[PDB]
């Protein structure tokens, strides 16, 4: 079987400003097969109220999903996306960088 | 509006 | 306005340990999802995912649910068939994907149709652009091709793709026009990040745009530059719009030589951004 590992971007919907409500996105794409686990973390802890898009795929058959949650960013809170997929020997954690 | 009434099996 | 598409995407994943395949179907007009079906959801119905489809009446929802359920059963069968064609074990999970749809051009008439099918994430069989002939990747797909030729499947699909498909695409485009026929041009800006005493990164941002197609390119003194650049994949904002950025690393003090050029359907002429602070 072709196995393709996920690309991951972690980003806010709006420009980040401390104290103002926003949405934190984890966009996973380019993967195959479709089974994938994705959590959003705040200070290393799993966020419960995370939703995701309906599974779709690109021109090359690879899958993509957006996972997201409301959040109110601050100066010292750290956020990240944690992904597991059959192609990863351990979960991959990608930290949110507000300039990316 | 989807194609119908069904797709043929492979 | 410009060209438009209607597309349906279907994924089925076998569950060899217990039960039926997982089946997920999504429908789009352009870059806007408007319907979903998920075999694991409670409704067991085709469901709306844009406001402008909610006005369709019960005969529409019953018909779409009927079709999508039948399709799921076809993929259920195919998963068994293909496991046999490929002499695979009953133990593993496998995947079927199908996409089909139609485009209308700038004249608002039929432009093209498509129907493609994949097994385990690889091409299996596809309708050619002529809507009359099939591309089969291997001898398993060749068997399917002979099945579908004998059953005149291409004729049936062509009739849908040239007629019904574009008639419903045009209906959706009108009923959803407030959003579907609005172009949202990218909101652009540039940021500046020192990387050392001698170099800086310029990052050109395109935000809140629709449709998704966009081109960002850097120029130095009016000539395209790809060396020392980075471009991220276009990504969904979550509110139906998209985002992208491109960046270039430049000698500090020379920022003003560099221009970011942004092309998008919502922009009558391309935008040019320059750091002159
Ligand atoms: Br299973």
Author numbering:
A (entry chain B): 0 to 99
B (entry chain C): 1 to 10
C (entry chain A): 0 to 276
Authors' text:
We demonstrated that the TCR from the 1E6 T cell clone bound to HLA-A*0201–ALWGPDPAAA using a limited footprint and very weak binding affinity. Here, we solved the structure of the 1E6 TCR with 7 altered peptide ligands (APLs) determined by our previously published combinatorial peptide library (CPL) screening, 2 of which mapped within human pathogens. Concomitant with our global analysis of 1E6 TCR binding to the APLs, we observed a common interaction element, consistent with our previous findings, that utilized TCR residues Tyr97α and Trp97β, forming an aromatic cap over a central GPD motif that was present in all of the APLs. Ligand engagement is dominated by peptide interactions, but hotspot-like interactions with the central GPD motif enable the 1E6 TCR to tolerate peptide residues that vary outside of this region, explaining how T cells expressing this TCR may cross-react with a large number of different peptides.
We also solved the structure of each unligated APL to investigate whether structural changes occurred before or after binding — which, combined with an in-depth cellular and biophysical analysis of the 1E6 interaction with each APL, demonstrated the molecular mechanism mediating the high level of cross-reactivity exhibited by this preproinsulin-reactive human CD8+ T cell clone. Competitive functional testing revealed that the preproinsulin-derived sequence ALWGPDPAAA was one of the least potent targets for 1E6, with only the MVWGPDPLYV and YLGGPDFPTI demonstrating a similar low-activity profile in MIP-1β secretion and target killing assays. Additional small movements in the Cα backbone of the peptide around peptide residue Asp6 were apparent in the A2-YLGGPDFPTI (KD = ~400 μM), A2-ALWGPDPAAA (KD = ~208 μM), and A2-RQFGPDWIVA (KD = 44.4 μM) structures. The weak binding affinity between 1E6 and A2-MVWGPDPLYV and A2-YLGGPDFPTI generated thermodynamic data that were not robust enough to gain insight into the enthalpic (ΔH°) and entropic (TΔS°) changes that contributed to the different binding affinities/potencies for each APL. The potential requirement for a larger degree of induced fit during binding to these weaker-affinity ligands is consistent with the larger entropic penalties observed for these interactions.
